[PDB]
């Protein structure tokens, strides 16, 4: 159960983190290059 | 050849200097990949009997609109018989070697005829070839036993 | 065919794939009359130098004439710097274009020879003294015809990129 | 002098120059088949231009396109107009034709270093240029103006 | 002879495009119109599969080629393999039962059932096309309709999951386009797109590995490969049951089937380089997606990760250069199609009945919904690789293809089998954790005042209809092996020499 | 001196005389027949161009106009843009109580300037005809006259467009100087070597100034800041007309003044466009994600689409010709004028152009919502629609020629554009009775004149964004026979 919480952490936070960081970074660069 | 997962061609198992082949090519019922277990000469001698008994008891499977499974079981158990005869001939006593490889040749020519009859969905010729190949299957069964 | 000294090969790949290996072009080199050009050509085998013919193209093809190639920096016929710095001279035009299958090195004019060569196909004996002439094909002239018969374009380039896949010193010498 | 813009070509057929009365070293190699070079239209040519010793400095194959020139109306060098059309009865070019030219400096860019961008020049003084014209076609839609 | 596969593929769209306005402003008319169309299409598919499809010949049957665009050499190549007819029948069955399960939808049901029929055409187009660029067309044609029946139907954060899915799948379909562009242009002289003409080419390894990367990044998200798998637990876990039972039922299998078509028999010498690592990836995938599932409080994300886990056996059978391995991969494609379809169906109906999602809440509901309880238990047993169900024979034939592999050696086979069979300890854990959390128990506040409705006859027929092939394939696997095995040899004949 | 090859253009100016005649006699009593004679002038020019299709690429005037098949195609596309946008502004003018007269003049003469710019050959005409276009553009943008935001917008438009043309014509000046004293592009490259200035810094400066002015006139992402400020203020129909028409005419020029007179430096030139192309593919498709307007994000999406077009500009005529670029400009017209027609109808019925007001259109108008969704999906290109297959042809030519970093970035940004297109399609499919606005709640389709001709061009653009992706082989075959651009 500890291993399951650890693995779903690794999935939701720091490998879904990259997949969601692509979009967060695209939003952020869009707003930046919109206001700069 | 890096230990785990040999790569590249994925080679076939070889044919060790035997005349068990056809001489107009190697053979046609050969299944490409089968895990023939390297048991030992008694184990090969018994597994020949078992696969020949299978091919012998494949009598019920034959019929109209069933020849595909006949061809599949044929080429499978004949591939097992091929590699087992290869290891038996290569580990023979050199006095029963020649009759045994002639037996294997006259058995495998008949397996080739049977595969040619079943792959082409020829039922009557399949059975008419199954007659003498059944004679040969009982012959190898009473030889190994 | 005066004293083939060094056999060497570059194997080509016509068409869309890069590693099809459409035959090979085994050539002999007259390493006694022309030391500079033959030593250059042996070096352009990438043996001791990062720059070399490996990956370069045959950037000009003309029917019933010569197939040029041997530029590796560029692909048009500009970057052809030799091993001797950038560009070296011509040497002792003793022999002639014997006809099909020569390895005359390409230069703009006098005393400006680089990396680029051209494989002759038809008897062009009227390049003597202008371009240094050496080398000869000994296996694969039908591959040269296979290069020649390719449909060219406005720029006299082959429509299919005729790339050299490898270029190594053969064990003859 | 310098700035050859190194482009190693193969060479062209040598032939003797049947000189002209205007000093032009004129040399026909392959006579074209088609319409004559018209005075005043855009014509597509290919060429390799060489200095006295034979070094190449400009070529239309270097940029991989025929050169579109308006001949006759002085948009080009007088050597080019007099070696393409012919003023003193020199035969003009046809389409698909080839021709060698030894342009003298009286017709070429004089004793003037034509083209001097930084320190050194594209052409030196008294160059006595050497052109190898390959007339490829007329421009498909062209005017005499 | 006859344009069979074309009237298979275009018929759902060409019959849902008859709903232009169609002034019947209840869900009844279009619901019955589209289930009738789906039944008609399934029957056309079967009459093509029964009386006009030779199951012994491992070649292209019902072939059909037109000329669409001459510049790309882009045809309308259609064709059926032994490894594609099963996925086509599964598409018919699962999408038909999906539009059956979508009977109670009434929001914009005309648009819903039209997009269902669009998916129904696009999936069979992807499975039946023997042209590379057409495979790309029908890959991206099941991208917008799924988006529209995912963002406006089902799921709390449905918009996030839908945009994540569409952008992930498009960002992988561009890799697929890089692959088809590479093969078509830089494939050989006379550039083509017809896979039948294409499967016997050279493709040197320095270019074959590049094509294999370009196609594996494409198929690594559709059959989720664990570096690139995060779209699924958001997409499935926040979708309606009728869409999710084909998102896992048949949409997940393209990518697994694709790794067989355009990777296994088109780029064999590069698959012989890449399958050793796909094996390690799949073995880690089973454990990873079986250990993340106890991590999920949610009910539906648990089954999404379950699908990520059960795709690992297909990855392994594909990377097993064997007849048993690939036959187990195709059999697991079909088996998990049925299983995941019915499991997502039952989870959606359980959410509709209970209106609770997380397993911390939602205690004992077995007495409330006993029919759902027993069907969920039977299908969890089928997900468990339990004998008598197709999951067992799939997740055993893949093992047998490992242990009878000529590519790999014993030092690796031991590790691979060990890490594979830990998966079947961890899979009991999450499946029976789900069962004991959501069904086994007694909640004192739910005694009689709720008295929820049980599984109606429609939903019971859904679950039973998806169960009976699972049982029938567990007791007789050659309902699925026999339609593929010959073709599998036509794959592996390209591998041994 | 019978220059008949310009008959499809002279028709326009002939019709324009008639326009002023209708402005002369009665001065108020001709609302619909004026638009009628204008549209019939457009279609008469079109059929004259189709009648003069089989002629050779003969240069008519004294070295001033080349009526090639390529320039013929681009003149056909400009006339198609004008003919498909001429029924867009039959109601915008009567909405803002402006004069239909002299708006038809500006549209007709901008079409004329684009038609001449496509076939222009002198550096004079590559200056005069773009300036006919640009001056008519500044007039069309500042036409409502209802506020001060649009007035400052179009004044900044005028200033930056004048600076753009001035940079372009400074580059043309350096062409005319470094090339001896030669203009007339086919003779320009001969001039660069008759004077031996082909390898000179002056001609490199000419290339840089010319491509900067073109990127200004093509709104490529470095030189692009004008379109967002000036397409928000200008009225939507002339936004459509000038965006699409200026970009197709400037693509005709960006083929003409680059392939004919600048091929000798075609290495360096390519890099410039490649940079701009990559930038115009990224930032445009990376800006419109985070834009709350609609005309503004449409302008940025248009920037992205032209960034895809520069892929077909970069590839020559041999290794994948200009047919991909031609058919993509065709689909770009067909699937952007439809989007602008839907944005027009949403703004003649609701009033506003903010994007949050589009939420709820599926309930009020299923046909308009379906048309806008299909047009945006064509622009993004998930299923087999026009823009998808156009991008496919572009990336095919790019891969075949060997532009991998153009094609890969274009595909990344195609996904990036799919995002905001579906963000639009989120709104006009969803609805919750409060996420809609009080500008969407009162839509009022039926309080209208009749079934307009706006809807005719809108459904024509929808069909031409849907089926020409399918029916693409005729378009490819009629675009492949433009091999005479040299
Ligand atoms: C391509 C770059 C991603 C651009 C757009 C992007 O940021 O996606 C946008 C998407 C969330 O944006 P939405 O506006 O769809 O947000 C959901 C809302 O509609 C309401 O929850 O982010 C993702 O789901 C991650 C996508 C990873 C895609 C890989």
Contact F287 A29 (CB under 8 A): no
Residue whose CA is closest, atom 24 of ligand 1? E164
SS3 letters across chain E? CCCHHHHHHCHHHHHHCCCCCCCCCCHHHHHHHHHHHHHHHHHHHHHHHHCCCCCCCCCCEEEECCEEECCCCEECCEEECCCCHHHHHHHHHHHHHHHHHCCCCCCCHHHHHHHHHHHHHHHHHHHHECEHHHHHHHHHCCCHHHHHHHHCCCCCCHHHHHHHHHHHHHHHHHHHHHHHHHHHHCCCCCCCCEHHHHCCCCCCHHHHHHHHHHHHHHHHHHCCECCECCHHHHHCCCCCHHHHHHHCCCCCCCCCCHHHHCCCCCCHHHHHHHHHHHHHHHHHHHHHHHHHHHHCCECHHHHHHHHHHHHHHHHHHHHCCCHHHHHHHHHHHHHHHHHHHHHHHHHHHHHHHHCCCECCCCCCCCCCCHHHHHHHHHHHHHHCCCCCCHHHHHHHHHHHHHHCCCCCCHHHHHHHHHHHHCHHHHHHHHHHHHHHHHCCCCCCCCCCCCCCCCCCHHHHHHHHHHHHHHHHHHHCHHHCCCCCHHHHHHHHHHHHC
Listed in sequence order, the DSSP H helices in chain B are 41-56, 67-90, 97-119, 123-144
Q: How many angstroms does the Cα of residue F417 sit away from the middle of ligand 1?
A: 12
Query: What is d(CA F239, CA F236) in angstroms, rounded to the nearest whole number?
Result: 5
Backbone Cα Rg of chain A: 15
Chain A residues in contact with F286 (beta carbon < 8 A): 26, 29-30, 33
Q: Count the alpha carbons within 13 Å of C17 in the hemisphere toward its beta carbon.
A: 20
Contacts of B31 (CB under 8 A, 6+ apart): B75, B76, B79, E489
CB pairs under 8 A between A and E: 35
Contact F472 E163 (CB under 8 A): no
CB-CB: which of F189, F195, F201 is closest to D114? F195
Q: Which tokens sit at A8? A: 């779903």
Interchain contact D/F (3 or more Cβ pairs less than 8 Å): yes
In angstroms, the separation between the Cα of residue A1 and the nearest Cα of chain F is: 38
Q: Which residues line ligand 1 (CB under 6 A)?
A: A 19-20, 22-23, 26-27; E 157, 159-160, 163-164, 167-168, 171; F 415-416, 419
Judge whether E187 and F446 are in contact, CB under 8 Å. no
Q: How many CB atoms lie within 10 A of CB E210?
A: 17
Is some CB atom of chain F closer than 8 A to the CB atom of E181? yes
Q: How many angstroms does the Cα of residue E206 sit away from the middle of ligand 1?
A: 36
| Solved with | cryo-EM
Query: What is d(CA D63, CA D47) in angstroms, rounded to the nearest whole number?
Result: 11
Mutate to test the interface with A, among F285, F290, F423 (most CBs of A within 10 A): F290
CB pairs under 8 A between C and E: 28
Query: What is d(CA F317, CA E191) in angstroms, rounded to the nearest whole number?
Result: 19
DSSP label at residue B115: H
CB contact residues (below 8 A), chain E span 131-150, against chain F? 133, 137, 140-141, 143-144, 147-148
Contact B68 E489 (CB under 8 A): no
Mutate to test the interface with E, among C11, C15, C16, C20 (most CBs of E within 10 A): C16
Contacts of F62 (CB under 8 A, 6+ apart): D143, D145
User: In degrees rounded to 5, what are phi and psi of residue C139?
Assistant: -145, 120
Judge whether E355 and E424 are in contact, CB under 8 Å. no
Contact D70 F200 (CB under 8 A): no
**Mutate which of F419, F424, F432, F435 to test ligand 1's pocket (most atoms within 8 Å of Cβ)?**
F419
Query: What is d(CA D108, CA C41) in angstroms, rounded to the nearest whole number?
Result: 38
Give the CA distances from residue F464 to residues F46, F369, F378, F387, F471, in Å, rounded to whole numbers and listed in that order.
18, 17, 10, 10, 10
Contacts of E37 (CB under 8 A, 6+ apart): E11, E12, E15, E16, E117
Query: What is d(CA F320, CA F312) in angstroms, rounded to the nearest whole number?
Result: 8
Mutate to test the interface with B, among E54, E56, E212 (most CBs of B within 10 A): E56
Judge whether C14 and C39 are in contact, CB under 8 Å. no
Q: How many angstroms does the Cα of residue F291 sit away from the middle of ligand 1?
A: 15
Listed residue (E215, E223, E229) closest to E271, CA to CA: E215
In angstroms, the separation between the Cα of residue F220 and the nearest Cα of chain A is: 15
CB contact residues (below 8 A), chain E span 16-55, against chain F? 21
Q: Which tokens sit at F352? A: 């506003």
Give the containing element (helix H, strand E) for D57. strand D56-59
Pairing of strands C6-13, C163-169: antiparallel
Chain C residues in contact with E184 (beta carbon < 8 A): none
Judge whether E79 and E261 are in contact, CB under 8 Å. no
Chain C residues in contact with E203 (beta carbon < 8 A): 17
Query: What is d(CA D38, CA D95) in angstroms, rounded to the nearest whole number?
Result: 10
Is some CB atom of chain C closer than 8 A to the CB atom of D14? yes
Contact C17 E205 (CB under 8 A): no
Query: What is d(CA E458, CA E445) in angstroms, rounded to the nearest whole number?
Result: 29
Segments making up each domain of chain F, as ranges:
1-486
Is some CB atom of chain E closer than 8 A to the CB atom of F426? yes
* Local structure of F180: helix, strand or coil: coil
Residue whose CA is closest, atom 1 of ligand 1? F416
Judge whether C7 and C137 are in contact, CB under 8 Å. no
Listed in sequence order, the DSSP H helices in F124-148 are 125-141
Query: What is d(CA C83, CA C51) in angstroms, rounded to the nearest whole number?
Result: 9
In angstroms, the separation between the Cα of residue A26 and the nearest Cα of chain F is: 7
Chain D residues in contact with F264 (beta carbon < 8 A): 63
The burial class, CB within 10 Å (0-12 / 13-18 / 19+), for C114 is buried
Chain A residues in contact with F283 (beta carbon < 8 A): 33
Query: What is d(CA E65, CA E73) in angstroms, rounded to the nearest whole number?
Result: 11
Query: What is d(CA D61, CA C76) in angstroms, rounded to the nearest whole number?
Result: 9
Catalytic residue positions of C, numbered: 60, 65, 68, 107, 118, 127, 131
- For C91, left (φ over 0), alpha (ψ -120 to 50), or beta? beta
Chain E residues in contact with C19 (beta carbon < 8 A): 204-207
Structural domains in chain C (count): 1
Domain extent, residue C159, equals 1-173
């Amino acid at each position: 159960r500890r291993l399951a919480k650890q693995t779903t952490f690794f999935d939701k936070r720091i490998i879904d983190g990259i997949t969601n960081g692509v979009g967060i970074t695209s939003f952020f660069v869009g707003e930046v290059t919109k206001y700069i | 050849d890096n230990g785990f997962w040999i790569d590249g061609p994925l080679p076939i198992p070889p044919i060790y200097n035997n005349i068990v082949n056809e001489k107009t090519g190697t053979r046609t019922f050969i299944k490409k990949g089968v895990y023939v277990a390297d048991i030992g000469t008694k184990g090969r001698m018994y597994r020949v009997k078992k696969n020949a008994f299978d091919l012998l008891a494949m009598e019920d499977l034959i019929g109209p609109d069933t020849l595909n499974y006949v061809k599949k079981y044929l080429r499978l158990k004949s591939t097992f018989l091929f590699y087992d005869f290869d290891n038996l001939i290569s580990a023979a006593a050199s006095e029963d070697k020649q009759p045994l490889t002639d037996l294997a040749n006259r058995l495998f020519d008949n397996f080739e005829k049977l595969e040619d009859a079943a792959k082409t969905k020829n039922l009557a010729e399949t059975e008419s070839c199954y007659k003498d190949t059944k004679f040969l299957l009982q012959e190898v069964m009473t030889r190994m036993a | 065919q005066s004293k083939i000294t060094h056999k060497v090969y570059f194997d080509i790949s016509v068409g869309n794939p890069v590693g099809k290996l459409a035959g090979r072009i085994v050539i002999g080199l007259y390493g006694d009359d022309v030391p500079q050009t033959v030593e250059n050509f042996r070096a352009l085998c990438t043996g001791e130098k990062g720059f070399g013919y490996k990956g370069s193209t045959f950037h000009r093809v003309i029917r019933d004439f010569m197939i040029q190639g041997g530029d590796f920096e560029k692909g048009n016929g500009t970057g052809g710097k030799s091993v001797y710095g950038r560009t070296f001279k011509d040497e002792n035009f003793k022999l002639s274009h014997v006809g099909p299958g020569v390895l005359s090195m390409a230069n703009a004019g006098p005393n400006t020879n680089g990396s680029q060569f051209f494989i002759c196909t038809i008897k062009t004996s009227w390049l003597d003294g202008r371009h240094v002439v050496f080398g000869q094909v000994i296996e694969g002239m039908e591959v040269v015809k296979l290069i020649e018969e390719q449909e060219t374009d406005r720029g006299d380039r082959p429509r299919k990129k005729v790339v050299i896949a490898d270029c190594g010193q053969l064990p003859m010498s | 002098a310098t700035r050859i813009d190194y482009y190693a070509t193969v060479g062209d057929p040598l032939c003797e120059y049947s000189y002209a009365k205007s000093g032009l070293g004129f040399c026909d190699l392959d006579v074209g088949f088609g319409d004559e070079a018209p005075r005043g239209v855009l014509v597509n040519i290919h060429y390799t231009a060489r200095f006295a010793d034979g070094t190449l400095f400009d070529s239309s194959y270097k940029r991989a396109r025929p050169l579109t020139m308006r001949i006759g109306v002085g948009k080009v060098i007088r050597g080019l107009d007099q070696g393409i059309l012919g003023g003193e009865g020199v035969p003009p070019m046809r389409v698909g034709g080839k021709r060698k030219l030894q342009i003298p400096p009286k017709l070429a860019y004089g004793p003037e270093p034509a083209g001097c961008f930084s320190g050194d020049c594209n052409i030196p003084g008294n160059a006595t240029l050497l052109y190898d014209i390959n007339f490829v076609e007329i421009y498909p839609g062209s005017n005499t103006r | 002879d006859f344009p069979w596969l074309t009237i298979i593929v275009v018929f759902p769209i060409s019959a849902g495009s008859l709903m232009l306005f169609l002034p019947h402003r209840g869900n009844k008319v279009n619901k019955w119109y589209t289930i009738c169309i789906c039944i008609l299409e399934l029957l056309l598919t079967t009459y093509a599969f029964c009386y006009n499809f030779k199951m012994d010949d491992p070649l292209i049957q019902l072939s059909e080629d037109y000329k669409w665009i001459d510049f790309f050499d882009f045809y309308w190549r259609m064709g059926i393999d032994g490894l594609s007819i099963g996925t086509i029948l599964l598409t018919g069955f699962i999408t038909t039962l999906a539009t059956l399960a979508a009977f109670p939808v009434t929001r914009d049901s005309r648009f819903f059932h039209f997009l269902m029929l669009a998916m129904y055409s696009g999936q069979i187009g992807s499975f039946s096309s023997r042209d590379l660029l057409l495979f790309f067309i029908m890959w991206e044609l099941e991208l917008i309709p799924v988006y529209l029946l995912l963002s406006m139907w089902g799921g709390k954060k449905r918009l996030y999951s839908a945009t994540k899915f569409i952008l992930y799948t498009a960002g992988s379909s561009i890799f697929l386009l890089i692959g088809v562009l590479g093969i078509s242009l830089y494939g050989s002289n006379e550039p083509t797109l017809n896979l039948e003409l294409l499967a016997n080419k050279s493709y040197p390894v320095t270019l074959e590995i590049l094509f294999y990367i370009g196609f594996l990044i494409a198929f690594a998200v559709k059959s989720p490969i664990i570096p690139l798998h995060t779209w699924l637990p958001d997409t499935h876990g926040e979708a309606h049951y009728s869409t999710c039972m084909l998102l896992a039922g048949i949409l997940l299998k393209m990518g697994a089937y694709g790794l067989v078509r355009i990777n296994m028999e088109l780029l064999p010498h590069a698959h012989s380089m890449f399958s050793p690592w796909l094996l390690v990836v799949g073995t880690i995938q089973i454990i990873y997606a079986a250990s993340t599932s106890p991590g999920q409080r949610n009910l539906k994300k648990r089954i999404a990760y379950s699908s990520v886990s059960h795709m690992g056996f297909i990855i392994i059978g594909i990377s097993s250069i064997t007849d048993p391995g690939l036959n187990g991969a195709i059999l697991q494609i079909i088996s998990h199609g049925f299983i995941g379809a019915a499991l997502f169906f039952l989870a959606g109906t359980s959410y509709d009945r209970i209106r609770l999602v997380y397993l911390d809440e939602m205690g004992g509901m077995a007495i409330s919904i006993p029919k759902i309880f027993t069907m969920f238990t039977i299908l969890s047993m089928a997900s468990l690789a339990l004998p008598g169900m197709s999951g067992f024979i799939a997740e055993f034939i893949v093992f047998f293809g490992i242990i009878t592999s000529q590519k790999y050696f014993l030092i690796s086979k031991i590790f691979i089998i060990f890490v594979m069979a830990i998966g079947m300890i961890l899979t009991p854990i999450y499946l029976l954790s789900m069962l004991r959390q959501m069904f086994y128990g007694y909640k004192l506040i739910n005694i009689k005042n709720f008295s929820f409705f049980d599984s109606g006859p429609r939903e019971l027929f859904l679950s039973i209809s998806i169960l009976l092939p699972i049982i029938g394939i567990g007791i007789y696997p050659d309902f699925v092996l026999s339609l593929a095995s010959d073709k599998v040899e036509s794959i592996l004949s390209n591998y041994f020499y | 001196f019978d220059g008949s090859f310009i008959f499809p253009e002279c028709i326009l100016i002939f019709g324009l005389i008639l326009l002023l005649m209708i402005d002369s006699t009665s001065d108020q009593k001709d609302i619909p027949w004026l638009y009628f004679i204008s549209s019939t002038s457009f279609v008469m020019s079109i059929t004259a161009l189709l009648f003069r299709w089989r002629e050779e690429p003969m240069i008519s005037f004294s070295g001033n106009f080349q009526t090639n098949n390529f320039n013929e195609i681009f003149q056909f596309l400009i006339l198609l843009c004008s003919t498909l946008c001429i029924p867009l502004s039959v109601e915008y003018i009567e909405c803002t109580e402006m004069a239909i007269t002299e708006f038809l003049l500006f549209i007709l003469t901008a079409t004329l300037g684009g038609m001449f710019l496509c076939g222009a050959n002198d550096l004079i005409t590559i200056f005069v005809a773009p300036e006919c276009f640009s001056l008519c553009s500044y007039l069309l943008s500042g036409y409502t006259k209802k506020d001060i935001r649009s007035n400052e917008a179009t004044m900044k438009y005028l200033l930056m467009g004048g600076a753009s043309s001035s940079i372009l014509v400074h580059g043309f000046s350096w062409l005319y100087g470094s090339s001896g004293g030669e203009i007339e592009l086919q003779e320009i490259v001969n001039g660069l070597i008759n004077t031996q200035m082909y390898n000179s810094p002056g001609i490199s400066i000419a290339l840089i100034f010319i491509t900067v002015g073109i990127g200004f006139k093509l709104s490529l992402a470095p030189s692009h800041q004008w379109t967002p400020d000036v397409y928000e203020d200008s009225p939507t129909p002339v936004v459509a007309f000038l965006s699409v028409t200026s970009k197709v005419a400037a693509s005709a020029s960006a083929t003409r003044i680059f392939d004919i007179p600048f091929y000798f430096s075609s290495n360096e030139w390519h890099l410039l466009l490649e940079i701009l192309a990559i930038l115009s593919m990224i930032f445009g498709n990376l800006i419109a994600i985070t834009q709350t307007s609609m005309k503004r994000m449409l302008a940025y999406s248009s920037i992205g689409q032209i960034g895809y077009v520069i892929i077909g500009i970069i590839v020559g005529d041999s290794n994948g010709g200009y047919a991909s670029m031609i058919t993509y400009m065709l689909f770009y017209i067909a699937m952007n004028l439809g989007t602008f027609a839907c944005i027009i109808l949403f703004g003649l019925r609701t009033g506003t152009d903010n994007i949050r007001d589009y939420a709820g259109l599926y309930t009020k108008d299923p046909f308009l919502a379906l048309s806008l969704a299909l047009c945006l999906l064509s622009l993004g290109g998930l299923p087999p629609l026009a823009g998808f297959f156009g991008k496919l042809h572009l990336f095919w030519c790019g891969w075949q020629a060997g532009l991998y970093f153009l094609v890969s970035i274009g595909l990344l940004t195609s996904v990036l554009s799919i995002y905001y297109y579906l963000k639009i399609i989120k709104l006009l499919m969803t609805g919750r009775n409060q996420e809609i606005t009080p500008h969407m709640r009162n839509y009022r389709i039926s309080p209208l004149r009749s079934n307009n001709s706006i809807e005719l061009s809108m459904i024509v653009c929808v069909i031409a964004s849907t089926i020409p992706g399918i029916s693409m082989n005729p378009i490819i075959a009629i675009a492949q026979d433009t091999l005479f651009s040299f």
